[model samples]
Target chain A: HMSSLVRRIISTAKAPAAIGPYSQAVLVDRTIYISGQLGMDPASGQLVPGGVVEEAKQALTNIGEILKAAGCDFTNVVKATVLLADINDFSAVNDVYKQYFQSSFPAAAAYQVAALPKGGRVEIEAIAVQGPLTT
Target chain B: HMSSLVRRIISTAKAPAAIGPYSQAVLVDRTIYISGQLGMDPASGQLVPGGVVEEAKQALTNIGEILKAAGCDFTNVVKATVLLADINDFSAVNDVYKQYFQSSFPAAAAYQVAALPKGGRVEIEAIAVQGPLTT
Candidate 1:
């Protein structure tokens, strides 16, 4: 007989609500699986207007909100995948990204994507661990 | 007093060796972070000779090998992200994907990327838990 393990679905009013059938993040044990997030606004459910940089900031902000809802933050993140609509935007996105993740950088992979949901310029997904971690 | 939390790097000859500094997978506590795998053959370190479907099979094969090296299998996977060079390849990739993950399917996110590393047509990455897991 198997005992139970917990899988918690994380959500927050501070972040844009999921538009589809997925949770904002799912916490299995101590690991959090954050869904791919776009720059859509929580109130209007529309992509924040500005440019790729704005979208990157909003997307990351969304991730932070999800992490907070799950009781962690960027420092808890161990890996991230950045999906860009254009490869040229990589440098700009990284600038915004570094501001959020200042230390103990997570392993990351970034690449240009042909398209993104909602025609958004950027999407980012992350994996984080709940911690009292040691280096 | 801070006790150490272990982060173990996983590698295997059964899977293609990492060409970069990143580990094939990193196990921190019970969770494993698998790197994105392309269709590159472990023997030759080249994209296996075939089209997208073949690439899809090889890519998933690579993930399986990495999972095995980490002491688990597809069934231990809790989440996956499928990156396709062409969105049209989704169905074909899924056909191969389903074969590996037959039950208790992980949460997944899939999308078309502008490009994959090494001109590969598909890249798949995953997160798995070591278990005795209960649904």
Candidate 2:
């Protein structure tokens, strides 16, 4: 009975591999929750080489890949929360971010933090809409 | 039409002005979504005085203003997500937060990040209930 509402876990090797017990993403009903993505290369299992800007782009790229795996994209995202290790890097991150979103951007929140897991400079998580799949 | 589902955008000069193109708050049907509020004085357009505690208090006050503008308060909030530039200030932010909420606090998620816009230490966004605004 519990499984009915909880739905199924989503895992895909098409994107960077999960570093922990959690799935890379989960699609329950019409909502898709993408786990936090770090700037890591899935193939080599190493932090992608770059500074904050490059890392932000890569992190979001990973999110894009997962969304694609789930059959959606940035346009389907309803909300996103971004965490950054350096507040000064906001413009750089924001500049790259604008490329992925258009005028009707999703509800968003961002913050500068002291640290992130695995020493990543940035991490991003998103909630996307996944309307009932059609036959 | 798209008009039926989008509902109306809620705004109030009682809160600090929006720094960007977004509205101060948006109310769609039964859901009232408040924009991210910073610790700024609406009249002066200046960051509110004091440390993290004071900033947090004022930032939430700004959110409260929007809630009031929509005929609701923190009690109507179902979920609140917080972003802080400094993790060490979590206790300070959480302490003041306790005063505004009661036993059944809404679902929440928090993270410490690099920086917030305008150099503020904290930013908060909330999802609230507006039911049917009846006469």
Candidate 3:
């Protein structure tokens, strides 16, 4: 049973295609590990206009969409790490972030990164658990 | 119990201690979320000397040590995200990374960040499932 590791790649057109050598997200057992999402528009494959606020919304939107594809939602997110090119935008970014999860907020950490994919101002990666553990 | 959301903090002396607002890692059920690790020495809190390869080795070593404290190992890692200050050093970093795992490698995504905590060159976060997921 040690080979019980079940790695499933999650893909949805609602989110942008992974631009690198990684999946949009990977599911093992009941947990899903979402890759860092840039503010890239799924159809455009380019950064969305405006700024960090817009970018943060887009990034979280992308993560939300991926979670839905995995049969989960924002409430299922247990933890998240936010990478921002400019740490000064944290407050504005959180403002829009609140729109996604009206209830139970996930534990999170924010960092001031030097850069992100496509020069996007914000990127977010999430971990979500689907339902209860079912072996 | 859908409410079986348990958040456990993992701490150890073998790895460089966490320096900021985050834990060394968080365990919620079978999945362990290890914080991004820098090459800082736990005793000194200063980065280990040398360059990207050395920093990458130290970061991965920290992750492995933390996983050990949690009663798991590198083989349990399902996904990993690597952050580097220099994208060009990816090759050099991989040289040191390939030595850590003997079996299947965890799914990974490596990117260059604008900067890392303490001005370190490498940081890595991991998600590992402990033993078999038996709910």
Candidate 4:
């Protein structure tokens, strides 16, 4: 017999609130699905003011908070999909992303889109593993 | 309590080899994940000599072999992501792709990129399921 795990909604006061219909993150079994995040400030609900690197940093920070709320961290991420409104901004995004994790980078796919919701230059969504880290 | 499944790296002479710091495919539990594949020839390691349709066919063939190696096939794929160096080629790519798959196609996301690792028009990665075919 097959047993289905009902999706668990996750939220946290520490992160920017969801501006739309989806939960900020959801944990189904060991998989943690972080919603696509824009560069909105958690307190102000406005995009952090800066160029590509700044926006990239804030977006990643949002993802980090969602992961934390789900009881996981960057190390648990198995896959990530990054969307950039401009292909020219990849170097800036990659430079900022490299500072976030050490070795064991997740499998990733990156794209350049004509546009993204909220008019942000970068958006990120991730799939992370959930469990206690091995010592 | 949590138990980790060591990542299982997959390789086969029947498919084009990995051209970089990654595996051709990996299997964990029922998930058979194939790495991004370009249109390189398994025998020559050079970009296949052809146009977009030819290259696309070769790349899908490589993916098919990886799935077979993992004891599954295209029917098992649950998701796929396609990257194209030229957006104008989408129609050409889709025409060839539709020939390779039937109903119950996997969830897919596709995008246009400025460049791919190999100087090719397309790159594909897939996620497949592994289980006995239900009767």
Top-lDDT structure, candidate number? 1
Candidate 4 chain B minimal-lDDT segment of 10 residues: B18-27
What docking class should model 4 receive?
A: acceptable
Best by DockQ: 2
Where does candidate 3 chain A have its weakest 10-residue lDDT segment?
A1-10
Q: Model 2, residue B94: displacement in angstroms?
A: 5.3
Q: Rank the candidates by lDDT, best first.
A: 1, 3, 4, 2
Candidate 3, residue A52: how far the Cα is off, in Å: 1.5
Least lDDT summed over 10 consecutive residues: which range in candidate 1 chain B?
B101-110
Give a tens-digit lDDT track for model 1, residues B40-104.
Answer: 89988999878899998998899999888876888788888888888777677878888887866
Clash number for every model? 2, 8, 3, 0
Estimate TM-scores for all models.
0.64, 0.75, 0.66, 0.75
Candidate 1's residue-wise lDDT over A1-135, tens digit each? Answer: 334467666779999975543567777877788888888898888999998999999989989998998889899999998988899999999999999999999999998778777778899989899877787
| Per-residue lDDT of candidate 3, residues B15-118 (tens digit) | 87657788898888667888888887778878988977788888888888999999888777778888889867766776677788544455565668777888
Q: Report DockQ per prediction, comma-separated.
A: 0.21, 0.27, 0.21, 0.24
RMSD of each: 5.4, 5.0, 5.5, 4.1
Candidate 4 lDDT by residue in tens digits, A13-119: 67788688989888987777889988888888788898667888998898888888887777766666667887667666867777775434555556576678878
Give the residue spans of candidate 2 off by over 4 A.
Answer: A1-3, A132-135, B1-36, B42-45, B65-72, B81-99, B102-104, B107-115, B129-135
Docking band of candidate 2: acceptable
lDDT of 3 by residue, A1-135 (tens): 344556566889999975654568777886788888888788888888998988888888889899989888888888887888888988888888878866778889987876666677888888888875332
Q: Rank the candidates by DockQ, best first.
A: 2, 4, 3, 1
Which of 3 and 4 is the better model by TM-score? 4
